[PDB]
Amino acid sequence: MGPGFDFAQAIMKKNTVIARTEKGEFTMLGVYDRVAVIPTHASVGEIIYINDVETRVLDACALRDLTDTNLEITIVKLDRNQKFRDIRHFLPRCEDDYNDAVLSVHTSKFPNMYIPVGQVTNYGFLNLGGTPTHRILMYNFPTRAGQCGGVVTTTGKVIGIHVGGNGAQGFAAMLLHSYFTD
Numbered sequence: 488m489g490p491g492f493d494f495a496q497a498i499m500k501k502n503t504v505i506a507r508t509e510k511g512e513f514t515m516l517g518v519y520d521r522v523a524v525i526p527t528h529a530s531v532g533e534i535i536y537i538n539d540v541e542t543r544v545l546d547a548c549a550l551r552d553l554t555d556t557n558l559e560i561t562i563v564k565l566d567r568n569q570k571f572r573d574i575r576h577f578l579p580r581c582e583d584d585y586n587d588a589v590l591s592v593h594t595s596k597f598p599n600m601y602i603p604v605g606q607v608t609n610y611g612f613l614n615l616g617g618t619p620t621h622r623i624l625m626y627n628f629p630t631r632a633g634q635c636g637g638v639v640t641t642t643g644k645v646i647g648i649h650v651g652g653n654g655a656q657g658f659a660a661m662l663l664h665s666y667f668t669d
């Protein structure tokens with residue numbers, strides 16, 4: 488409907504796949520080459536389904552900060568025959584607050600879904616499903632089951648992936664440029 492949504496749809500059409508693990512279907516953001524991200528609670532194994540194709544996982548790393556605190560981001564390298572458009576130049580370099588964000592989801596259950604979530608707070612610490620978690624972004628939208636892995640964007644930036652909510656607020660893990668240097 489506006490430049491926020493246009494940015495969102497562009498990231499969603501070229502840089503997302505549907506990932507299926509034993510814990511469900513997730514929106515999965517492709518970042519560059521064969522490297523994508525997913526919430527760590529997806530419990531990625533040796534094999535994952537990508538758009539319903541059986542795919543070997545070449546590497547998976549659950550990120551933690553230098554205090555050894557969960558960040559809820561798993562970086563996955565897929566044995567896929569095709570590279571993602573490199574979007575690393577849309578990743579923020581630092582922890583920050585944002586205005587006017589969109590949360591975008593693409594699954595069997597929620598195809599082509601775009602939610603204007605509004606102001607995003609650098610919340611920091613969250614007890615997420617009983618796990619101490621850092622670098623959490625917060626937005627005042629009642630997000631629901633099925634939205635985990637959804638991409639959080641502003642105009643010009645891919646800032647996070649949706650990892651949970653409490654019925655009134657939603658929570659995203661930050662994406663930082665430093666996670667994807669090579």
Ligand SMILES: Cc1ccc(CNC(=O)C2CCC2)cn1
Pocket residue numbers: 493494496497498500577
């Ligand atoms: C569906 C669609 C595709 C591309 C575009 C043009 N803008 C971009 O490519 C953005 C830079 C990162 C995403 C707009 N809408």
